[PDB]
Amino acid sequence: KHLERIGLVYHPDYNLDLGPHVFPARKYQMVYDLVKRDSKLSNLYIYKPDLAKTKDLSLVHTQEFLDDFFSLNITERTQYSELPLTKQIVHSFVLAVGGTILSMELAQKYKFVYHIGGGFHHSMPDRAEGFCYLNDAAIASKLYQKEYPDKKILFIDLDLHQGNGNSFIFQNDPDVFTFSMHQENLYPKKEKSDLDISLEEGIGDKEYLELLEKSLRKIESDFKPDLIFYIAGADPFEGDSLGDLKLTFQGLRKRDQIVRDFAYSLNDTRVVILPAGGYAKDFYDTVTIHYNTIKIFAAD
Numbered sequence: 001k002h003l004e005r006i007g008l009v010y011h012p013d014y015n016l017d018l019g020p021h022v023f024p025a026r027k028y029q030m031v032y033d034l035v036k037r038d039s040k041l042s043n044l045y046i047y048k049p050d051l052a053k054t055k056d057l058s059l060v061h062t063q064e065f066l067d068d069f070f071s072l073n074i075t076e077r078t079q080y081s082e083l084p085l086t087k088q089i090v091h092s093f094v095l096a097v098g099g100t101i102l103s104m105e106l107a108q109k110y111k112f113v114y115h116i117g118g119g120f121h122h123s124m125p126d127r128a129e130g131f132c133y134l135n136d137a138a139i140a141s142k143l144y145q146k147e148y149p150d151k152k153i154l155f156i157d158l159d160l161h162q163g164n165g166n167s168f169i170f171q172n173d174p175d176v177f178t179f180s181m182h183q184e185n186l187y188p189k190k191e192k193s194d195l196d197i198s199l200e201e202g203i204g205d206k207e208y209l210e211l212l213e214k215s216l217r218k219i220e221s222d223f224k225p226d227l228i229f230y231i232a233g234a235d236p237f238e239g240d241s242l243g244d245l246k247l248t249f250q251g252l253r254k255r256d257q258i259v260r261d262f263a264y265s266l267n268d269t270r271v272v273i274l275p276a277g278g279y280a281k282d283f284y285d286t287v288t289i290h291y292n293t294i295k296i297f298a299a300d
């Protein structure tokens with residue numbers, strides 16, 4: 001009964017100008033600004049992380065990989081990232097891992113924590129890929145598991161792309177369940193999640209949401225989570241420049257509402273919400289979709 005509805009995590013140093021790169025790495029500050037500009041949401045508490053500890057990074061990542069990451073070294077461990085490797089990028093990723101860990105800690109007092117940052121679901125123990133250098137949700141999961149050895153974690157991954165890093169890290173862990181709905185013909189090389197729904201180009205709201213509702217029933221038939229990481233990507237949007245799925249703004253809202261309501265129906269459960277991707281042709285649509293997720297989870 002102590003639980004408050006929703007808190008936010010953010011750090012302004014997440015934001016980077018990546019120049020011509022496809023990834024809108026300044027989305028975070030504008031999602032944050034839309035929150036600040038809203039008279040309802042501007043009343044939520046915002047928490048700021050410190051840099052994640054290297055010892056915590058090591059719960060998921062190999063020392064060889066961390067050596068290459070921190071030294072800005074170009075090797076097989078870093079060269080598949082599809083991103084530059086600069087001190088600013090290192091700094092932004094280590095802060096964001098700190099943010100996702102903080103979000104998970106905040107789930108002790110909030111039903112929902114929306115992290116305006118993170119969702120690095122392609123990051124592997126020994127190699128970066130898919131614009132992801134460190135695995136924020138995997139690291140936070142390992143910490144949560146040390147705190148609560150009996151508790152269970154569900155990843156609901158509704159970003160356009162499979163959460164392969166998470167599927168791989170948790171493939172032999174019975175206390176973690178990975179669920180993903182993703183476009184099948186895109187990056188990445190597919191791992192075996194606990195439940196994968198392979199989507200075809202052109203899927204619309206009705207079919208997508210039907211598959212989601214069915215999938216959540218399937219999950220709960222097999223698995224009762226205490227903590228959920230909801231990877232609430234913006235990239236299934238019909239206007240996305242990378243994806244070919246055709247979810248509307250209202251479809252993405254309904255998606256978020258379905259996940260929200262699934263959590264509400266499980267009394268002990270808490271949710272950390274992570275934005276992951278989004279490549280709308282209009283940058284402002286990406287921002288708007290993430291803002292809409294916050295508004296959904298914050299709703300009366």
Ligand SMILES: CCCCCC/C=C/CCCC(=O)O
Binds near residue numbers: 119122130161
């Ligand atoms: C903040 C600067 C660094 C770029 C952050 C990249 C985050 C990638 C997230 C997942 C990609 C996707 O699933 O579409």
Ligand SMILES: [K+]
Binds near residue numbers: 157158160162163181
């Ligand atoms: K996904």
Ligand SMILES: [Zn+2]
Binds near residue numbers: 233
């Ligand atoms: Zn994505």
